[PDB]
Design a protein around this ligand. Structure first.
Ligand SMILES: CN[C@@H]1C[C@H]2O[C@@](C)([C@@H]1OC)n1c3c(c4ccccc41)[C@H]1CN[C@H](O)[C@H]1c1c-3n2c2ccccc12
Ligand SMILES: N#Cc1c(O)c2c(-c3ccc(-c4ccccc4O)cc3)csc2[nH]c1=O
Ligand SMILES: O=P(O)(O)c1ccc(-c2cc(O)on2)o1
Ligand SMILES: O=P(O)(O)c1ccc(-c2cc(O)on2)o1
Lengths: 409, 298, 172
């Protein structure tokens, strides 16, 4: 009524997410409705989430998709952070599944196509949601899916795994509940598989009152497939809800499935025909140097993308690092003494994780790599070698640093 | 005129595959191990890294294996001691004692026109793409990769008058003093012509007077693959016997045939050369990827 | 410009008196338990006090100042960096290699690293130098062959821009 922030009058609370409270914002002059997420400055600094909130704003500011909540502006005050974003009248997808009996295969497919398109956009921009559920998926007046709550989201790095257990237990992947390292996209596919089941069946595939009993069901990966569900959609759900993340389906696999292909619009995915004419590919950043120049880049990229055989492919066995059957304390003691002989400087991050460095005598530049000890099956350990990005050759300098370490060990 | 403007605008980066394999050899590595590694990995050439100098010195090709065999082979009874014991650095030492070689390379940011010019001018078939920022070798650029890339953009640009003209009228390729081999010619004799004449392939002719097969430089790695390198006294037909079963006939083109037909034939068959023929069956010359690329540059 | 004055405590009637006004009582709107009022204020220091249920009180979580008589009033910081989002997060963020060595087991090896790009079979109808699109998580990692006749073979997949290069080094 009286409370105003950037010409917007704050109304009733829409709900509370992972970080901060979300409230309705009606315009004082027009009456236009926006969603305002209030992040308390003291609450952020007390939880060491200053870096997480920074990445959250930076991503949403550059994120442009019709199935992801658009962030208009962010207002900073000396005590709070006001995130002004797109408002959707339809509410939660969870409420739609609860109000109706079961969402029909004609409408459930359309909603899933919109969800996966937004999920794929995140993954292509190196962002993994980690908290996908019908409660987090929103709906509008025109019945379109909208992705919200990027609080538990994280950035995907080259050669780096994620450990943080994020999301609801019913929607969490078997690797998430176990507390083990994962790549990222495979977790979102599992979560999307639960949403697809929830839309068609009306219930959850893994549901139990007892917490460890529920965890046992996810690890097992056994779920009921109803008689009203066709054979085509049944195979898709089984491939999406795989215990093994390697055997689990990908966005490219779902897009190629016969059930998903049905009535799929040509503007949702980048490889489709209508995408290049309706969606901006952000080529303006590369075409900023010196009107027809933009269309030249899009056409050249299309010819290169079409010829898959020209850029991509359709004896002794290789292995990652070095394997040892001895105790973890003995392996770590062996690596420290081997480095002193070669005159190396190392930064300690963890008991098994080491940030190592050396100086090249010919070029003069510093050579740095990251070491990490992993656990294989049982009683067997693996030492991992990973090159750090920041006259000679960077890749050759990394291979030589590894070669001297393996020989000394 | 039209294709010259295309190559000047497009960078070397556009040709590099999305996910490619690169084999690199250290100079201190034994030469025998290097040729065996080329077969197992399925690569035709590999850049050479000098550990002491901390820089890429050159390229190890099949020509190096041909040069070792012809210079050191004595008999099928006595083993080639130099091939068995020599390192890459030691082999290069005697090879560069006559004339040394500064590394010929292209930047990924440099235009495609400069890359084609660098291949024809230096008379080389393989050019390594090295990033000046990191110093890492990214991809080995060939004449085959450039022509296949240009074939993708033939519809995007308007076709000039020369593309609809016959090979006779254009006169592209070698038509005089073509180095050829007989069907009973031993491997050692054939290797000697590769060193003396500095050619890449030799057409095989029978006693009747007809081109039966073609003995190229790539056919030499089979001697290292099957470990039959120690006996170079054997005929050229016995050396080509490994791929003779799948073989139908060596690819040919006519003088009256248009330039567009010749370019399309080389990219589809994925071969490096075409035999020029008159009327029914008369050899006139050899047209290769290097001859076609030079015509689009000059 | 926009400054937030929120009352976390309970009550029915809450008023705000500060330095912005001549210590006058301003009515505050309530949602459920929180009493809030957003006012436009310039750069500098501003003193304020709350009036809950007919009695003067102060917020404990906010910094306080005491005068000569004994009146307790809150202190608010109005900075130029406080209004810009990227600048405000930078302020909140504000608030070496030893050569010496340093009982839980190490983490379980993920199955993604076991997927070797070189061991995977490729179709005969393509160039041998070509490889399938690698996972972003297998990049920079070192893969090696078993040592045979004093020669180590080392391999690692690296990204240049949008292209991936799988280099192999035969080093004795
Ligand atoms: C458990 N789910 C809730 C549902 C509810 O509040 C949350 C906390 C959750 O969503 C993730 N919230 C929603 C949105 C939001 C964004 C970021 C983080 C959490 C969020 C927005 C964005 N625009 C929407 O209109 C609006 C929408 C919201 N919620 C609503 C309830 C009714 C009508 C609209 C809303
Ligand atoms: N908890 C939560 C939370 C808030 O509600 C606010 C608010 C707020 C409180 C109440 C109201 C309100 C007041 C009267 C009527 C309706 C309202 O939504 C508006 C905004 C301002 S900063 C802030 N920070 C928070 O962490
Ligand atoms: O001049 P080179 O780059 O050393 C060279 C080595 C091998 C070949 C070759 C193979 C082949 O079928 O045609 N040419 O060319
Ligand atoms: O100078 P050329 O002998 O006419 C020539 C043309 C094309 C090639 C060639 C060799 C090769 O490995 O890939 N392409 O060699």
């Amino acid at each position: 009524g009286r409370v105003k922030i950037g010409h917007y009058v704050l109304g009733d609370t829409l709900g509370v997410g992972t970080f901060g409270k979300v409230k309705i914002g009606e315009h004082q002059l027009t009456g236009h409705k926006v969603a305002v997420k209030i992040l308390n400055r003291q609450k952020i600094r007390s939880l060491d989430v200053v870096g997480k909130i920074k990445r959250e704003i930076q991503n949403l500011k550059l994120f442009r998709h019709p199935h992801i909540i658009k962030l208009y502006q962010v207002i900073s005050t000396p005590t709070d952070f006001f995130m002004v974003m797109e408002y959707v009248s339809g509410g939660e997808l969870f409420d739609y599944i609860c109000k109706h009996g079961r969402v029909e295969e004609m409408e459930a497919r359309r909603l899933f196509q919109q969800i996966l398109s937004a999920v794929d956009y995140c993954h292509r921009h190196m962002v993994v949601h980690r908290d996908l559920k019908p409660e987090n998926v929103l709906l509008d007046a025109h019945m379109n899916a909208k992705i919200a709550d990027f609080g538990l989201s994280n950035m995907m790095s080259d050669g780096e795994f994620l450990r943080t257990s994020c999301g609801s237990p019913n929607y969490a992947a078997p690797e998430v509940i176990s507390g083990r390292l994962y790549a990222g996209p495979e977790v979102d596919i599992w979560s999307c598989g639960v949403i697809l089941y929830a839309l068609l069946c009306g219930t959850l595939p893994f549901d139990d009152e007892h917490v460890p009993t529920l965890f046992k069901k996810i690890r097992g990966g056994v779920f009921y497939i109803p008689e009203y569900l066709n054979r085509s959609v049944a195979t898709l759900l089984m491939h999406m809800l795989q215990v093994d993340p390697l055997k689990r389906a990908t966005i490219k696999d779902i897009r190629e499935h016969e059930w998903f292909k049905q009535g799929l619009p040509s503007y949702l995915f980048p490889e489709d025909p209508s995408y290049d004419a309706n969606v901006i590919d952000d080529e303006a950043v590369k075409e900023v140097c010196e009107a027809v120049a933009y269309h030249l880049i899009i056409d050249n990229r299309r010819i290169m993308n079409q010829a898959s055989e020209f850029y991509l492919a359709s004896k002794a066995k290789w292995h990652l690092g070095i394997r040892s059957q001895s105790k973890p304390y003995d392996i770590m003691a062996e690596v420290y003494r081997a480095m002193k002989q070669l005159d190396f400087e190392w930064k300690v991050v963890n008991a098994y994780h080491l940030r190592v460095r050396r100086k090249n005598p010919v070029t003069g530049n510093y050579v740095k790599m990251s070491l990490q000890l992993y656990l294989v099956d049982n009683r067997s350990y693996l030492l991992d070698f990973k090159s750090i990005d920041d006259l000679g050759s960077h890749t050759m300098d990394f291979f030589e640093m590894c070669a001297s370490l393996i020989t000394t060990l | 005129s039209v294709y010259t403007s295309f190559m000047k605008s497009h960078r070397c980066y556009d040709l590099i595959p999305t996910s490619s394999k690169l084999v690199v050899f250290d100079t201190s590595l034994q030469v025998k191990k290097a040729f065996f590694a080329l077969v197992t990995n399925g690569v035709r050439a590999a850049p050479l890294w000098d550990s002491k100098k901390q820089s890429f010195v050159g390229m190890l090709t099949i020509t190096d294996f041909i040069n070792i065999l012809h210079r050191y082979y004595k008999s099928a009874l006595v083993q080639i001691y130099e091939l068995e014991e020599h390192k890459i650095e030691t082999w290069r030492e005697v090879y560069l004692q006559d004339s040394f070689k500064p590394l010929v390379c292209i930047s990924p940011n440099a235009s495609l026109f400069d890359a084609v010019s660098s291949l024809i001018r230096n008379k080389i078939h393989r050019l390594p793409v090295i990033d000046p920022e990191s110093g890492n070798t990214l991809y080995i650029l060939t004449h085959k990769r450039i022509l296949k890339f240009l074939k993708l953009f033939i519809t995007e640009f308007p076709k000039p008058e020369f593309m609809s003209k016959s090979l006779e009228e254009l006169q592209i390729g070698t038509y005089a003093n073509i180095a050829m081999v007989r069907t009973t010619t031993p491997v050692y004799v054939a290797l000697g012509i590769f060193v003396q004449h500095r050619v890449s392939a030799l057409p095989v002719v029978d006693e009747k007077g007809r081109v039966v097969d073609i003995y190229s430089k790539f056919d030499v790695i089979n001697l290292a693959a099957e470990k039959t390198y120690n006996n170079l006294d054997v005929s050229v037909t016995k050396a080509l016997q490994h791929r003779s079963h799948y073989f139908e006939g060596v690819l040919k083109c006519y003088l009256h045939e248009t330039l567009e037909t010749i370019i399309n034939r080389l990219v589809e068959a994925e071969v490096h050369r075409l035999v020029v023929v008159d009327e029914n069956d008369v050899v006139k010359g050899i047209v290769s990827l290097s001859d076609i690329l030079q015509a689009l540059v000059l | 410009r926009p400054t937030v004055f929120r009352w976390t405590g309970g009550g029915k009637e809450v008023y705000l008196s500060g330095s912005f006004n001549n210590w006058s009582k301003l009515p505050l709107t309530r949602s459920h338990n929180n009493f809030v009022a957003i006012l436009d204020l310039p750069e500098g220091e501003h003193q304020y006090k709350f009036f809950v249920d007919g009695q003067w009180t102060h917020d404990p979580s906010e910094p306080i100042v005491t005068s000569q008589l004994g009146t307790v009033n809150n202190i608010i910081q109005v900075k130029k960096t406080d209004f810009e989002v990227f600048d405000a997060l930078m302020v909140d963020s504000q608030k070496q290699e030893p050569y010496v060595c340093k009982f839980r087991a190490p983490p379980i090896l993920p199955p993604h690293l076991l997927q070797v790009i070189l061991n995977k079979d490729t179709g005969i109808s393509c160039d041998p130098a070509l490889l399938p699109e690698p996972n972003h998580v297998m990049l920079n990692h070192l893969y090696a062959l078993s040592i045979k006749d004093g020669v180590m073979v080392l391999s690692a997949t690296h990204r240049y821009k949008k292209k991936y290069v799988t280099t192999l080094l035969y080093k004795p």
